[PDB]
Amino acid sequence: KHSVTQYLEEIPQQVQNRLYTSPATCLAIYRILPPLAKFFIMAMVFNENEVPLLDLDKWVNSNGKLQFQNAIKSMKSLHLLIPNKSSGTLMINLNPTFKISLRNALTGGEVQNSFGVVVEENVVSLDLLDEYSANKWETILHFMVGTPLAKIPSEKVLNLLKHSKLMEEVNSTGEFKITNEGFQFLLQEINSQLWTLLLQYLKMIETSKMDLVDVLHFIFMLGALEVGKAYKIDALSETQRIMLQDMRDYGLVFQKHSNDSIFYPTKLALMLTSDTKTIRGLKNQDIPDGSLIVETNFKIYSYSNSPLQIAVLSLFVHLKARFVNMVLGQITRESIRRALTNGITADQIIAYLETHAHPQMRRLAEEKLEKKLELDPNCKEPLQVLPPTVVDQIRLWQLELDRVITYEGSLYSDFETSQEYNLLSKYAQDIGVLLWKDDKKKKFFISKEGNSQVLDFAKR
Amino acid sequence: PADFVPDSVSGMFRSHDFSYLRLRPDHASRPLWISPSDGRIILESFSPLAEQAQDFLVTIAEPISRPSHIHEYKITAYSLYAAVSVGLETDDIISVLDRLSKVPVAESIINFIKGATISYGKVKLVIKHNRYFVETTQADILQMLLNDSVIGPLRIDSDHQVQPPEDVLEREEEDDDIDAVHSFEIANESVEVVKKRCQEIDYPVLEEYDFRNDHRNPDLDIDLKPSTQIRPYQEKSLSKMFGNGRARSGIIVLPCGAGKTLVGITAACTIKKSVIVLCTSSVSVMQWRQQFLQWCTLQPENCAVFTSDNKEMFQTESGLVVSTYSMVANTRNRSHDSQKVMDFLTGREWGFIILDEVHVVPAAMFRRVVSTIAAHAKLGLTATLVREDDKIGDLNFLIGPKLYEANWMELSQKGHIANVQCAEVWCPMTAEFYQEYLRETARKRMLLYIMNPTKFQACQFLIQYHERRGDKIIVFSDNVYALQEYALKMGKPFIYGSTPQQERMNILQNFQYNDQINTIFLSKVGDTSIDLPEATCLIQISSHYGSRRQEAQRLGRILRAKRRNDEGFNAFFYSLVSKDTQEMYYSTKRQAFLVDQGYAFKVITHLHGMENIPNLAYASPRERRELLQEVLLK
């Protein structure tokens, strides 16, 4: 996942505050900050005064303070606040546009972009207008990953996928195939995928007539609430309505028929952030309508199915003869080698199998789960949750398709005595932050969680 | 000519469609889902009669999958005949299948199951006076027997005799069809021709085995003591061949090296009647008589071993007998000891015949130890599911029905076999091997990854390890130089390439009784064959050793049994492979074999003290390169 949060901080301070102009986008940016950061926002939203850091440091006691550093670092990067070396101390206060737009949007304020929705006869039924949007996703997804029929008609979407290199498919040849980016599309399920595409279109639709605050105000307007009436008609900008209609065409606006009506607030705008329940001629057997087969014998036992889904399954397994309930396919090191040929690491597929194919592997996963976590310290042998035998073959296959390694962090120095390095190393394993070390070199290339706490303990 | 697909017709009936093949109407309300086209029968957790369903499938067919959620279905003609010989109602199985199997019973599948239940023999081989004759319960049976050259022409005109049917059953036809019908007593000579003509004319005969028409005389010098080793698959295999009440010899496909003769000695003793034992070769007759039959209850004073180079006491041997095929019939009919034993074999009436690996030697001589004598029983302790003696008149329908088959899950799991551990170490890669891999695509890379001095090291760790544990180590290394280079690198009294058998035996004596030498290296000369030594820690280096049927053999052959339980995995199987070399494909081929064999298996590439072992000779990539140059010579 590109972690779109890192994009909001990347946009400079003003366009954030420009973004922060709508109490909608004040109230919006608030829910993604880490819970420590959330707690430090609202305090100083209302008490109209800055606060010394010593109090904010004394507010957070021992471990959990790492989230206190997690809170403050994400806080500053997107500049919703202003640190102030006023008298050599640290005077913490919101980027005031955030706090009051929040406070306004808190106490019924002037978020008119937030209040841009309209309430009318909400004729959009629970089943109505999102099956198109759900089918919109189904057709384009079959198009993008490559279905038997790639019914994705989003020309603006297709250019973004090829132009953003969303799928490692030959856009010049029309190929919609899974590359490293296309493999990543197969990993980020609802948020992350809904995150990933929102980034490609922003990169694609960023040359002319962006109006990002309006784009972000319009994006946050359609996903913030069911604009319902007057969303695509009134509560939408010129480029925003084109984005709303483009979001309408992409399904992300379930823009009702006539192309000129209230914001068809499809559920697709909801899922991009909700990170909650995901279930969307006149027949749609669900929810467990999908099916697959993954067991200890390393074989597909398919009884339920879905074409694009089994097309996706076939992207890493041979298909031989689709039967009444089963598709003749057997997962092997050769079968995953179809994806390793594409450079697809055996990493996201790990999380994929534990989540996907479950509608047929419910009992199989449920029998695998066994609740062997409270029994884990009791019966020290976990009962095959989650299946480890597959991943080692994947890892060994990945190791067979491997031999490049690298690490993150930063090399560290000025470790003067062995006691501090020994004491720092000993505490590091307590919280788990040290990749590799050596007393001989007094150097290691890891995160700075070790450096921040020794400085904080020494300084305060 | 004389070949029958029905015995070996297993391996089909797995192909369906989606347009023509509809979802089974039971699919809504059916505990199973019989995929008839795919031949698969998935017995999910929803089947209440899953145990009842599981047994029925195992009879008529072979359950390929036994998954925790659902099982798997496969078709076996021998199973179909065996499930036909199972006796379950063909219609009754189908309906409980149809009601249970949500997938509707396939039309082809339904016909085969009914064809199993009734066919797999509709023959009419009648019997008279508690014996076998040329007759039939059905009419097409009496026609087959009377118009038979062996059944009819070899059949005496007498309808039946209590003693003649008792004695002669034109050999022993203790495998006939339904008796107590119209038939005539057959002679004492030659059911080869009986079976060789039902062979030529394709008479699948619904056969039985009348096990106390395994009577055959006043009681022989048999010591009915069960002191011979008993362990659980043998007894329920016996319980299958002992059936209801009294000893029936069936066909019980048993392995040589897991107490095969033990069921035969018991069934021979149980009948309390004259019995002969036939093993592969005379030299194996002594080996078999040596390595178990004195641990067994058998007193070899009675068991005259015969070679016709080995004259022994024929026609005076008071108790049971152990002879061998090439003796009992062959071009190797080579002193009148042989014939006179056979003259005695015909002379004395024998109740039971224990047979060991009849398949290797042509059935024609077995058909000639089935041409002359007319015992009452045999016992086919076969070793392979499909054999060159699978003629359309199978040796199953001359000894007794199948009681023991490829379903070696019911029986050995009852407590016979111990735990066997298998492992596959990935020897680390070093540039030259790959440069050696790069330069030649040929198979000559074989020893080029075998030589890996790191591979020597891991071996030595096991050596010090199993020496520390007082354990025993088998290494399977067919190289000569790098093995010598390694045996030189270890420096223990070592069995190696072309090891002197006395030195082999000396090292073996210094290996199993003495724990100082706790590492021997078995080259390709171990199989086949030596009297293979006991397996606690098997290491295998060479992995071509084709074909793979041998790799089943070696795995079975090299992993011998161990009466040591000090170690938690008393049969280690190891395979030192240079990772990233030519046999990663073939090392991956061995792993799938073992897990199909079911041996407990693992991978240990994070060796405890891998570089901490003694004798890091050639450890460096340079010396691995240097030994790689050393082995490019080989």
Swiss-Prot record, chain B:
pH effect on activity, per entry: Optimum pH is 7.25 for helicase and ATPase activities.
EC no. given is 5.6.2.4
Question: Which keywords does the record carry?
Answer: ATP-binding, DNA damage, DNA repair, DNA-binding, Helicase, Hydrolase, Isomerase, Nucleotide-binding, Nucleus, Phosphoprotein, Transcription, Transcription regulation
What Gene Ontology molecular-function terms does this entry list? 3'-5' DNA helicase activity; ATP binding; ATP hydrolysis activity; DNA binding; DNA helicase activity; DNA translocase activity
Which Gene Ontology cellular component annotation is one that this UniProt entry carries?
Answer: nucleotide-excision repair factor 3 complex
Q: Which reaction does it catalyse?
A: Couples ATP hydrolysis with the unwinding of duplex DNA by translocating in the 3'-5' direction; ATP + H2O = ADP + phosphate + H(+)
Which protein, by its recorded name, is this?
Answer: General transcription and DNA repair factor IIH helicase/translocase subunit XPB/SSL2
Q: Which gene encodes it?
A: SSL2
